[PDB]
Amino acid sequence: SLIRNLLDQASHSVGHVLRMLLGPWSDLLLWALLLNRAQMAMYFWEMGSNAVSSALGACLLLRVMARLEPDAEEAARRKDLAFKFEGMGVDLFGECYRSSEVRAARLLLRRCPLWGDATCLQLAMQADARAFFAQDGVQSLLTQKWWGDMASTTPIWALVLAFFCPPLIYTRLITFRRRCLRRWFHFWGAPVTIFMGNVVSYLLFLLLFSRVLLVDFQPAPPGSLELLLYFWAFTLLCEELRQGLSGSLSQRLRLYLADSWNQCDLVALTCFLLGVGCRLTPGLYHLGRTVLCIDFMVFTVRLLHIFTVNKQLGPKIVIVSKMMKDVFFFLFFLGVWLVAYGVATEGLLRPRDSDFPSILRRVFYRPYLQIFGQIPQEDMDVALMEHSNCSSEPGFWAHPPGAQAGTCVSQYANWLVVLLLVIFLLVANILLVNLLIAMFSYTFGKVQGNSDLYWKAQRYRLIREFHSRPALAPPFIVISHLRLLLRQLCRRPRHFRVYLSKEAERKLLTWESVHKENFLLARARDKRESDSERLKRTSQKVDLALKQLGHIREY
Amino acid sequence: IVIVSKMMKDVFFFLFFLGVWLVAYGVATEGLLRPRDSDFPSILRRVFYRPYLQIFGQIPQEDMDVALMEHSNCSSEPGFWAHPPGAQAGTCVSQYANWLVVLLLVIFLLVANILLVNLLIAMFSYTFGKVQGNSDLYWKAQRYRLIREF
Amino acid sequence: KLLTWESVHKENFLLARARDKRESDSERLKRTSQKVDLALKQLGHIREY
Ligand SMILES: CC(C)CCC[C@@H](C)[C@H]1CC[C@H]2[C@@H]3CC=C4C[C@@H](O)CC[C@]4(C)[C@H]3CC[C@]12C
Ligand SMILES: CC(C)CCC[C@@H](C)[C@H]1CC[C@H]2[C@@H]3CC=C4C[C@@H](O)CC[C@]4(C)[C@H]3CC[C@]12C
Ligand SMILES: CC(C)CCC[C@@H](C)[C@H]1CC[C@H]2[C@@H]3CC=C4C[C@@H](O)CC[C@]4(C)[C@H]3CC[C@]12C
Ligand SMILES: O=C(COc1cccc(I)c1)Nc1cc(Cl)ccc1C(=O)O
């Protein structure tokens, strides 16, 4: 199995868990989980302490072991145990939140001594406990943390007005949980305010980049505006580099190459560096301008991910991410039909200007544009063209008026050319677009129910990442960077983690144990009231009656 | 009627996505081709209005493709320009990267006119199917209030 | 060896499906009905007492 060999390898030497494990109920529970004893795990859980934290840790280790399983059956057993176990854990935490909201809220951030001193939230995220993030209790607590010391009942427009007018903080609007200085730091350190500052800074960055690209990008040496834009770009590069380094050196970069949004930011920044180099070098000014235009497109795309936090939009964004397979199949089919129809028409009518770019244009671009209402009838039908004799080759040609429709086409089979145009319009503009409608509707209907749950996890990760992000905006985050490097240089000569009281820890443990035993007795009553169990009981009672009646049959 | 009132969230998300993609594509084309008439209203028109109208069958090929335009030498700046015939398409654009301009036009048409409209179809159908069953009940209450008010 | 393995797994599958059928509520209600009927019959066999 994966227990004896794992212990032998650890002795011969998740890795921290293996190191700490070697050959009060925590040890029994962990042994039950590693031995794949489902009933032992359940019972040790239910009669042991720290049920929620133990549940998150144990389901994390179940997922890890199922991934490590070389046997599909054992992996399936471990993973189904993990699903049932995370579900029952989240049910317990839901019934806990149903009792005392603030008690459960401070139960979350409780740094439990076991499982590597990691909070429940980090354990769930490492375990991919989407269901354990789904419940309204943890959702509301995450919302309040995103509104850290801001009384989340405040509306968004109040927040934007307060951001625009710093004096507005000391008003009746926007309540909150050196008083002026403390309020100032709370306002400017709240993760939601950090997010708003980042959004406004990014909008200003895009506006300035567009202004530079459309007006101030002459081949003259860079001006003050160009230098300032370069300064913002370098600051963003430093920001992303530090974020990747913080969130072991090579292991961290291998971790960072994931999270495709960071990949998009990285490729955008590399394109920016290439564009700056080409702009600075004399010869490649035009190439620099083109690549910077492409980079603007990439940055505008990244703005979407920056604006995925909205409660009504994130599921839709992950939906449109999921719809790529359907659009991609449609791309194949459209390409095939476009090749067929374009080559057919390019063979039926033979323009004199047979240059390769012109042939490729007439075979791909124009048929593609026929889909969206651009139909050059005067270019590809003879009855709309004036007849003339071009070449010595025997035929009737009727030179067109179009600039890139050819010098003059042939006309032997224009009836079948028009027939092909009709067929192509019927297939591409009717069969394909409406069939893509069908696939899009079906995919949305199937996927939305899991997309919203994935958005819950994504929003938790978003809250964590903006909490980890420093205070000042990217245009001024150079101050934060120099502050952190000074802190790095200060030690050379030398995550919410809300504190809980020591007696409060014991009171939370007792409260959680009491509510756990209440939930178990409730579920036991439910199982007893279940019709199948009742029929079981009736069957046994009837059997006992029959047996004891047989014991008096001799009378 | 109460359904179409409820559909505003979907149309509103679509408005966000269309605005983002329009900004991206418009600025890309406005940077790739550089009309001489760089007045602010003209720049804003070319970056927002014309790309928006490209969705509904208004494609100024003769305005933004060089192979359809007559070539001429406008300015001392080194390049080939090929002055357009359009009235508000610019005095004369540059032509260094019109292949990629046409590629961007193709990509924008594929995304906005195919991905977005059909995806909005999907959301509209799903929202209608989900909401009609309560919308009719709300209409019952609304009609009672209507009777009372008249 | 494949024949023996297949036969063993086949009889395992049949016994599993038999247990499933027995645990089925309809079959259980059948069994309860027959047990109640037998109890009634043998109680009638001692009615004369
Ligand atoms: C926030 C982003 C996405 C908006 C994109 C719109 C862009 C194209 C707009 C917004 C601000 C605009 C600039 C604002 C002011 C001027 C000064 C004027 O004398 C020349 C044009 C110029 C430089 C504008 C060009 C177009 C512009 C850059
Ligand atoms: C739906 C899909 C299959 C449609 C594909 C259309 C693409 C491939 C078409 C549309 C416009 C076309 C371009 C139009 C003009 C030029 C400039 C020329 O100097 C090189 C070829 C090039 C760059 C063409 C290559 C093919 C092209 C990019
Ligand atoms: C809705 C669908 C069915 C419409 C299809 C349009 C068809 C019927 C049209 C398109 C072009 C037309 C053809 C154009 C030219 C010719 C050549 C002539 O010597 C005989 C008539 C003939 C052959 C026409 C008959 C009708 C025609 C084939
Ligand atoms: O959805 C996302 C979110 O970032 C995006 C990055 C680029 C473009 C878009 I629109 C969104 N990225 C993913 C995209 C794919 Cl095609 C597959 C998986 C993921 C992922 O989230 O891992």
PDB file of N, CA and C in Angstrom, chain A residues 296-378:
ATOM      1  N   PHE A 296      -1.133  47.038 -25.988  1.00  0.00           N
ATOM      2  CA  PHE A 296      -2.313  47.711 -25.453  1.00  0.00           C
ATOM      3  C   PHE A 296      -3.510  46.776 -25.463  1.00  0.00           C
ATOM      4  N   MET A 297      -3.681  46.019 -26.548  1.00  0.00           N
ATOM      5  CA  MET A 297      -4.757  45.032 -26.576  1.00  0.00           C
ATOM      6  C   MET A 297      -4.623  44.049 -25.420  1.00  0.00           C
ATOM      7  N   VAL A 298      -3.403  43.567 -25.178  1.00  0.00           N
ATOM      8  CA  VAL A 298      -3.201  42.586 -24.111  1.00  0.00           C
ATOM      9  C   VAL A 298      -3.515  43.195 -22.746  1.00  0.00           C
ATOM     10  N   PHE A 299      -3.101  44.445 -22.526  1.00  0.00           N
ATOM     11  CA  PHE A 299      -3.390  45.112 -21.258  1.00  0.00           C
ATOM     12  C   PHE A 299      -4.890  45.298 -21.061  1.00  0.00           C
ATOM     13  N   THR A 300      -5.597  45.676 -22.126  1.00  0.00           N
ATOM     14  CA  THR A 300      -7.045  45.813 -22.026  1.00  0.00           C
ATOM     15  C   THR A 300      -7.691  44.473 -21.707  1.00  0.00           C
ATOM     16  N   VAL A 301      -7.141  43.386 -22.249  1.00  0.00           N
ATOM     17  CA  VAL A 301      -7.633  42.056 -21.896  1.00  0.00           C
ATOM     18  C   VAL A 301      -7.420  41.785 -20.409  1.00  0.00           C
ATOM     19  N   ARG A 302      -6.246  42.141 -19.885  1.00  0.00           N
ATOM     20  CA  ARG A 302      -5.974  41.926 -18.464  1.00  0.00           C
ATOM     21  C   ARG A 302      -6.903  42.748 -17.574  1.00  0.00           C
ATOM     22  N   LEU A 303      -7.362  43.901 -18.068  1.00  0.00           N
ATOM     23  CA  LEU A 303      -8.330  44.693 -17.309  1.00  0.00           C
ATOM     24  C   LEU A 303      -9.574  43.874 -16.976  1.00  0.00           C
ATOM     25  N   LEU A 304      -9.941  42.941 -17.857  1.00  0.00           N
ATOM     26  CA  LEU A 304     -11.075  42.063 -17.594  1.00  0.00           C
ATOM     27  C   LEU A 304     -10.863  41.251 -16.325  1.00  0.00           C
ATOM     28  N   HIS A 305      -9.708  40.589 -16.218  1.00  0.00           N
ATOM     29  CA  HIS A 305      -9.394  39.827 -15.015  1.00  0.00           C
ATOM     30  C   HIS A 305      -9.321  40.736 -13.796  1.00  0.00           C
ATOM     31  N   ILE A 306      -8.845  41.967 -13.983  1.00  0.00           N
ATOM     32  CA  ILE A 306      -8.855  42.925 -12.882  1.00  0.00           C
ATOM     33  C   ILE A 306     -10.284  43.237 -12.446  1.00  0.00           C
ATOM     34  N   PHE A 307     -11.248  43.144 -13.359  1.00  0.00           N
ATOM     35  CA  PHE A 307     -12.640  43.447 -13.035  1.00  0.00           C
ATOM     36  C   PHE A 307     -13.484  42.171 -13.040  1.00  0.00           C
ATOM     37  N   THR A 308     -12.957  41.087 -12.473  1.00  0.00           N
ATOM     38  CA  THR A 308     -13.735  39.864 -12.320  1.00  0.00           C
ATOM     39  C   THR A 308     -14.363  39.728 -10.938  1.00  0.00           C
ATOM     40  N   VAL A 309     -14.168  40.709 -10.055  1.00  0.00           N
ATOM     41  CA  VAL A 309     -14.601  40.565  -8.668  1.00  0.00           C
ATOM     42  C   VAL A 309     -16.115  40.702  -8.555  1.00  0.00           C
ATOM     43  N   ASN A 310     -16.743  41.385  -9.513  1.00  0.00           N
ATOM     44  CA  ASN A 310     -18.160  41.712  -9.409  1.00  0.00           C
ATOM     45  C   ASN A 310     -19.000  40.457  -9.222  1.00  0.00           C
ATOM     46  N   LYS A 311     -19.922  40.521  -8.260  1.00  0.00           N
ATOM     47  CA  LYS A 311     -20.668  39.335  -7.852  1.00  0.00           C
ATOM     48  C   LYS A 311     -21.536  38.798  -8.980  1.00  0.00           C
ATOM     49  N   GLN A 312     -22.021  39.672  -9.856  1.00  0.00           N
ATOM     50  CA  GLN A 312     -22.900  39.264 -10.943  1.00  0.00           C
ATOM     51  C   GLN A 312     -22.159  38.971 -12.240  1.00  0.00           C
ATOM     52  N   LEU A 313     -20.833  39.078 -12.259  1.00  0.00           N
ATOM     53  CA  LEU A 313     -20.077  38.979 -13.504  1.00  0.00           C
ATOM     54  C   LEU A 313     -19.055  37.854 -13.520  1.00  0.00           C
ATOM     55  N   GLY A 314     -18.483  37.496 -12.374  1.00  0.00           N
ATOM     56  CA  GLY A 314     -17.440  36.497 -12.310  1.00  0.00           C
ATOM     57  C   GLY A 314     -17.826  35.129 -12.848  1.00  0.00           C
ATOM     58  N   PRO A 315     -18.995  34.619 -12.443  1.00  0.00           N
ATOM     59  CA  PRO A 315     -19.477  33.375 -13.062  1.00  0.00           C
ATOM     60  C   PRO A 315     -19.609  33.478 -14.569  1.00  0.00           C
ATOM     61  N   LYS A 316     -20.049  34.626 -15.081  1.00  0.00           N
ATOM     62  CA  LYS A 316     -20.173  34.775 -16.526  1.00  0.00           C
ATOM     63  C   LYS A 316     -18.805  34.809 -17.200  1.00  0.00           C
ATOM     64  N   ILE A 317     -17.813  35.410 -16.541  1.00  0.00           N
ATOM     65  CA  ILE A 317     -16.462  35.431 -17.094  1.00  0.00           C
ATOM     66  C   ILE A 317     -15.891  34.021 -17.160  1.00  0.00           C
ATOM     67  N   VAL A 318     -16.074  33.236 -16.099  1.00  0.00           N
ATOM     68  CA  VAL A 318     -15.563  31.869 -16.155  1.00  0.00           C
ATOM     69  C   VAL A 318     -16.365  31.043 -17.160  1.00  0.00           C
ATOM     70  N   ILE A 319     -17.640  31.387 -17.368  1.00  0.00           N
ATOM     71  CA  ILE A 319     -18.419  30.741 -18.420  1.00  0.00           C
ATOM     72  C   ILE A 319     -17.789  30.993 -19.784  1.00  0.00           C
ATOM     73  N   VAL A 320     -17.539  32.264 -20.112  1.00  0.00           N
ATOM     74  CA  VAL A 320     -17.003  32.582 -21.434  1.00  0.00           C
ATOM     75  C   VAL A 320     -15.611  31.990 -21.595  1.00  0.00           C
ATOM     76  N   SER A 321     -14.893  31.791 -20.486  1.00  0.00           N
ATOM     77  CA  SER A 321     -13.651  31.030 -20.558  1.00  0.00           C
ATOM     78  C   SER A 321     -13.914  29.579 -20.942  1.00  0.00           C
ATOM     79  N   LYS A 322     -15.001  28.994 -20.435  1.00  0.00           N
ATOM     80  CA  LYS A 322     -15.317  27.601 -20.736  1.00  0.00           C
ATOM     81  C   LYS A 322     -15.851  27.403 -22.151  1.00  0.00           C
ATOM     82  N   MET A 323     -16.301  28.470 -22.809  1.00  0.00           N
ATOM     83  CA  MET A 323     -16.972  28.366 -24.106  1.00  0.00           C
ATOM     84  C   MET A 323     -15.988  28.262 -25.273  1.00  0.00           C
ATOM     85  N   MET A 324     -14.687  28.254 -24.967  1.00  0.00           N
ATOM     86  CA  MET A 324     -13.660  28.259 -26.001  1.00  0.00           C
ATOM     87  C   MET A 324     -13.685  26.990 -26.840  1.00  0.00           C
ATOM     88  N   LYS A 325     -14.020  25.844 -26.246  1.00  0.00           N
ATOM     89  CA  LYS A 325     -14.067  24.606 -27.022  1.00  0.00           C
ATOM     90  C   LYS A 325     -15.117  24.690 -28.123  1.00  0.00           C
ATOM     91  N   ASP A 326     -16.292  25.235 -27.800  1.00  0.00           N
ATOM     92  CA  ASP A 326     -17.337  25.373 -28.806  1.00  0.00           C
ATOM     93  C   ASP A 326     -16.936  26.370 -29.886  1.00  0.00           C
ATOM     94  N   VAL A 327     -16.425  27.542 -29.487  1.00  0.00           N
ATOM     95  CA  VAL A 327     -16.025  28.510 -30.510  1.00  0.00           C
ATOM     96  C   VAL A 327     -14.883  27.949 -31.355  1.00  0.00           C
ATOM     97  N   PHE A 328     -14.095  27.044 -30.780  1.00  0.00           N
ATOM     98  CA  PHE A 328     -12.910  26.504 -31.435  1.00  0.00           C
ATOM     99  C   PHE A 328     -13.295  25.440 -32.465  1.00  0.00           C
ATOM    100  N   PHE A 329     -14.277  24.600 -32.126  1.00  0.00           N
ATOM    101  CA  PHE A 329     -14.868  23.712 -33.125  1.00  0.00           C
ATOM    102  C   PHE A 329     -15.509  24.508 -34.254  1.00  0.00           C
ATOM    103  N   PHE A 330     -16.227  25.580 -33.909  1.00  0.00           N
ATOM    104  CA  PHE A 330     -16.820  26.417 -34.946  1.00  0.00           C
ATOM    105  C   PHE A 330     -15.747  27.002 -35.849  1.00  0.00           C
ATOM    106  N   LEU A 331     -14.606  27.377 -35.271  1.00  0.00           N
ATOM    107  CA  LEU A 331     -13.501  27.881 -36.077  1.00  0.00           C
ATOM    108  C   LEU A 331     -13.018  26.829 -37.065  1.00  0.00           C
ATOM    109  N   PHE A 332     -12.868  25.578 -36.615  1.00  0.00           N
ATOM    110  CA  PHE A 332     -12.515  24.515 -37.562  1.00  0.00           C
ATOM    111  C   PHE A 332     -13.523  24.413 -38.699  1.00  0.00           C
ATOM    112  N   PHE A 333     -14.810  24.317 -38.362  1.00  0.00           N
ATOM    113  CA  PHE A 333     -15.800  24.078 -39.409  1.00  0.00           C
ATOM    114  C   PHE A 333     -15.843  25.242 -40.390  1.00  0.00           C
ATOM    115  N   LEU A 334     -15.797  26.469 -39.866  1.00  0.00           N
ATOM    116  CA  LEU A 334     -15.806  27.647 -40.721  1.00  0.00           C
ATOM    117  C   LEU A 334     -14.576  27.685 -41.612  1.00  0.00           C
ATOM    118  N   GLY A 335     -13.409  27.326 -41.073  1.00  0.00           N
ATOM    119  CA  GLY A 335     -12.214  27.288 -41.897  1.00  0.00           C
ATOM    120  C   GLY A 335     -12.335  26.299 -43.037  1.00  0.00           C
ATOM    121  N   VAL A 336     -12.850  25.103 -42.743  1.00  0.00           N
ATOM    122  CA  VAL A 336     -12.998  24.085 -43.784  1.00  0.00           C
ATOM    123  C   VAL A 336     -13.932  24.577 -44.883  1.00  0.00           C
ATOM    124  N   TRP A 337     -15.107  25.078 -44.492  1.00  0.00           N
ATOM    125  CA  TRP A 337     -16.074  25.507 -45.496  1.00  0.00           C
ATOM    126  C   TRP A 337     -15.567  26.716 -46.271  1.00  0.00           C
ATOM    127  N   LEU A 338     -14.843  27.617 -45.602  1.00  0.00           N
ATOM    128  CA  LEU A 338     -14.272  28.769 -46.284  1.00  0.00           C
ATOM    129  C   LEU A 338     -13.247  28.341 -47.319  1.00  0.00           C
ATOM    130  N   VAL A 339     -12.377  27.390 -46.970  1.00  0.00           N
ATOM    131  CA  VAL A 339     -11.416  26.888 -47.949  1.00  0.00           C
ATOM    132  C   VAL A 339     -12.146  26.317 -49.155  1.00  0.00           C
ATOM    133  N   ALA A 340     -13.151  25.473 -48.905  1.00  0.00           N
ATOM    134  CA  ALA A 340     -13.866  24.841 -50.011  1.00  0.00           C
ATOM    135  C   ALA A 340     -14.495  25.881 -50.931  1.00  0.00           C
ATOM    136  N   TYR A 341     -15.290  26.792 -50.364  1.00  0.00           N
ATOM    137  CA  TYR A 341     -16.015  27.749 -51.195  1.00  0.00           C
ATOM    138  C   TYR A 341     -15.067  28.728 -51.876  1.00  0.00           C
ATOM    139  N   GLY A 342     -14.045  29.199 -51.157  1.00  0.00           N
ATOM    140  CA  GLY A 342     -13.116  30.144 -51.744  1.00  0.00           C
ATOM    141  C   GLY A 342     -12.345  29.554 -52.904  1.00  0.00           C
ATOM    142  N   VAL A 343     -11.842  28.328 -52.745  1.00  0.00           N
ATOM    143  CA  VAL A 343     -11.113  27.707 -53.846  1.00  0.00           C
ATOM    144  C   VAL A 343     -12.055  27.422 -55.007  1.00  0.00           C
ATOM    145  N   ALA A 344     -13.296  27.025 -54.709  1.00  0.00           N
ATOM    146  CA  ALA A 344     -14.256  26.782 -55.780  1.00  0.00           C
ATOM    147  C   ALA A 344     -14.493  28.037 -56.607  1.00  0.00           C
ATOM    148  N   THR A 345     -14.742  29.171 -55.948  1.00  0.00           N
ATOM    149  CA  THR A 345     -15.002  30.394 -56.703  1.00  0.00           C
ATOM    150  C   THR A 345     -13.737  30.898 -57.394  1.00  0.00           C
ATOM    151  N   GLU A 346     -12.575  30.747 -56.749  1.00  0.00           N
ATOM    152  CA  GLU A 346     -11.323  31.191 -57.347  1.00  0.00           C
ATOM    153  C   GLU A 346     -10.948  30.346 -58.555  1.00  0.00           C
ATOM    154  N   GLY A 347     -11.451  29.120 -58.628  1.00  0.00           N
ATOM    155  CA  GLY A 347     -11.229  28.302 -59.801  1.00  0.00           C
ATOM    156  C   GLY A 347     -12.246  28.573 -60.887  1.00  0.00           C
ATOM    157  N   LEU A 348     -13.499  28.806 -60.486  1.00  0.00           N
ATOM    158  CA  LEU A 348     -14.544  29.084 -61.465  1.00  0.00           C
ATOM    159  C   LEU A 348     -14.290  30.395 -62.197  1.00  0.00           C
ATOM    160  N   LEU A 349     -13.931  31.445 -61.466  1.00  0.00           N
ATOM    161  CA  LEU A 349     -13.563  32.720 -62.064  1.00  0.00           C
ATOM    162  C   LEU A 349     -12.063  32.920 -61.909  1.00  0.00           C
ATOM    163  N   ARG A 350     -11.405  33.317 -62.992  1.00  0.00           N
ATOM    164  CA  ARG A 350      -9.949  33.354 -63.030  1.00  0.00           C
ATOM    165  C   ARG A 350      -9.438  34.774 -63.253  1.00  0.00           C
ATOM    166  N   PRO A 351      -9.260  35.553 -62.189  1.00  0.00           N
ATOM    167  CA  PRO A 351      -8.713  36.905 -62.348  1.00  0.00           C
ATOM    168  C   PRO A 351      -7.299  36.872 -62.906  1.00  0.00           C
ATOM    169  N   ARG A 352      -6.970  37.891 -63.704  1.00  0.00           N
ATOM    170  CA  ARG A 352      -5.649  37.953 -64.319  1.00  0.00           C
ATOM    171  C   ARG A 352      -4.561  38.198 -63.281  1.00  0.00           C
ATOM    172  N   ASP A 353      -4.833  39.054 -62.296  1.00  0.00           N
ATOM    173  CA  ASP A 353      -3.854  39.372 -61.257  1.00  0.00           C
ATOM    174  C   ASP A 353      -3.763  38.197 -60.287  1.00  0.00           C
ATOM    175  N   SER A 354      -2.933  37.221 -60.652  1.00  0.00           N
ATOM    176  CA  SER A 354      -2.786  35.982 -59.895  1.00  0.00           C
ATOM    177  C   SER A 354      -1.636  36.052 -58.900  1.00  0.00           C
ATOM    178  N   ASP A 355      -1.341  37.242 -58.384  1.00  0.00           N
ATOM    179  CA  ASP A 355      -0.339  37.367 -57.336  1.00  0.00           C
ATOM    180  C   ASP A 355      -0.798  36.617 -56.092  1.00  0.00           C
ATOM    181  N   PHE A 356       0.161  36.036 -55.375  1.00  0.00           N
ATOM    182  CA  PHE A 356      -0.154  35.204 -54.214  1.00  0.00           C
ATOM    183  C   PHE A 356      -0.953  35.932 -53.137  1.00  0.00           C
ATOM    184  N   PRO A 357      -0.598  37.156 -52.718  1.00  0.00           N
ATOM    185  CA  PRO A 357      -1.457  37.843 -51.739  1.00  0.00           C
ATOM    186  C   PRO A 357      -2.870  38.073 -52.240  1.00  0.00           C
ATOM    187  N   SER A 358      -3.036  38.404 -53.523  1.00  0.00           N
ATOM    188  CA  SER A 358      -4.378  38.611 -54.061  1.00  0.00           C
ATOM    189  C   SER A 358      -5.174  37.313 -54.076  1.00  0.00           C
ATOM    190  N   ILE A 359      -4.534  36.210 -54.465  1.00  0.00           N
ATOM    191  CA  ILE A 359      -5.213  34.918 -54.477  1.00  0.00           C
ATOM    192  C   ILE A 359      -5.634  34.530 -53.068  1.00  0.00           C
ATOM    193  N   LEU A 360      -4.726  34.686 -52.101  1.00  0.00           N
ATOM    194  CA  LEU A 360      -5.061  34.368 -50.719  1.00  0.00           C
ATOM    195  C   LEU A 360      -6.177  35.256 -50.190  1.00  0.00           C
ATOM    196  N   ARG A 361      -6.151  36.548 -50.519  1.00  0.00           N
ATOM    197  CA  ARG A 361      -7.226  37.446 -50.121  1.00  0.00           C
ATOM    198  C   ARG A 361      -8.562  36.971 -50.675  1.00  0.00           C
ATOM    199  N   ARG A 362      -8.628  36.746 -51.989  1.00  0.00           N
ATOM    200  CA  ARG A 362      -9.881  36.335 -52.612  1.00  0.00           C
ATOM    201  C   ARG A 362     -10.352  34.969 -52.136  1.00  0.00           C
ATOM    202  N   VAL A 363      -9.448  34.110 -51.671  1.00  0.00           N
ATOM    203  CA  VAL A 363      -9.864  32.773 -51.270  1.00  0.00           C
ATOM    204  C   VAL A 363     -10.229  32.693 -49.787  1.00  0.00           C
ATOM    205  N   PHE A 364      -9.697  33.582 -48.948  1.00  0.00           N
ATOM    206  CA  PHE A 364      -9.980  33.516 -47.519  1.00  0.00           C
ATOM    207  C   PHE A 364     -10.731  34.728 -46.991  1.00  0.00           C
ATOM    208  N   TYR A 365     -10.238  35.938 -47.252  1.00  0.00           N
ATOM    209  CA  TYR A 365     -10.748  37.119 -46.564  1.00  0.00           C
ATOM    210  C   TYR A 365     -12.145  37.485 -47.048  1.00  0.00           C
ATOM    211  N   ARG A 366     -12.308  37.655 -48.359  1.00  0.00           N
ATOM    212  CA  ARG A 366     -13.607  38.034 -48.910  1.00  0.00           C
ATOM    213  C   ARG A 366     -14.706  37.024 -48.598  1.00  0.00           C
ATOM    214  N   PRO A 367     -14.517  35.712 -48.791  1.00  0.00           N
ATOM    215  CA  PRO A 367     -15.558  34.770 -48.353  1.00  0.00           C
ATOM    216  C   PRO A 367     -15.845  34.850 -46.868  1.00  0.00           C
ATOM    217  N   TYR A 368     -14.831  35.117 -46.044  1.00  0.00           N
ATOM    218  CA  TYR A 368     -15.074  35.305 -44.619  1.00  0.00           C
ATOM    219  C   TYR A 368     -15.953  36.522 -44.372  1.00  0.00           C
ATOM    220  N   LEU A 369     -15.692  37.617 -45.088  1.00  0.00           N
ATOM    221  CA  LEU A 369     -16.480  38.827 -44.896  1.00  0.00           C
ATOM    222  C   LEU A 369     -17.885  38.693 -45.461  1.00  0.00           C
ATOM    223  N   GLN A 370     -18.115  37.725 -46.351  1.00  0.00           N
ATOM    224  CA  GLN A 370     -19.474  37.491 -46.831  1.00  0.00           C
ATOM    225  C   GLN A 370     -20.430  37.119 -45.707  1.00  0.00           C
ATOM    226  N   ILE A 371     -19.917  36.589 -44.596  1.00  0.00           N
ATOM    227  CA  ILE A 371     -20.783  36.181 -43.496  1.00  0.00           C
ATOM    228  C   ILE A 371     -21.442  37.385 -42.837  1.00  0.00           C
ATOM    229  N   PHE A 372     -20.726  38.500 -42.724  1.00  0.00           N
ATOM    230  CA  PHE A 372     -21.171  39.652 -41.948  1.00  0.00           C
ATOM    231  C   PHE A 372     -21.699  40.777 -42.833  1.00  0.00           C
ATOM    232  N   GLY A 373     -22.391  40.422 -43.913  1.00  0.00           N
ATOM    233  CA  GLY A 373     -23.108  41.398 -44.706  1.00  0.00           C
ATOM    234  C   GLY A 373     -22.300  42.130 -45.753  1.00  0.00           C
ATOM    235  N   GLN A 374     -21.080  41.692 -46.043  1.00  0.00           N
ATOM    236  CA  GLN A 374     -20.261  42.291 -47.095  1.00  0.00           C
ATOM    237  C   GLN A 374     -20.260  41.335 -48.283  1.00  0.00           C
ATOM    238  N   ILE A 375     -21.158  41.570 -49.229  1.00  0.00           N
ATOM    239  CA  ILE A 375     -21.339  40.707 -50.386  1.00  0.00           C
ATOM    240  C   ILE A 375     -21.010  41.508 -51.639  1.00  0.00           C
ATOM    241  N   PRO A 376     -19.827  41.305 -52.223  1.00  0.00           N
ATOM    242  CA  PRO A 376     -19.470  42.031 -53.451  1.00  0.00           C
ATOM    243  C   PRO A 376     -20.099  41.426 -54.701  1.00  0.00           C
ATOM    244  N   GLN A 377     -21.405  41.660 -54.847  1.00  0.00           N
ATOM    245  CA  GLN A 377     -22.130  41.194 -56.024  1.00  0.00           C
ATOM    246  C   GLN A 377     -21.548  41.794 -57.296  1.00  0.00           C
ATOM    247  N   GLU A 378     -21.271  43.099 -57.275  1.00  0.00           N
ATOM    248  CA  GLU A 378     -20.691  43.749 -58.444  1.00  0.00           C
ATOM    249  C   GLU A 378     -19.294  43.226 -58.735  1.00  0.00           C
TER     250      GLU A 378
END
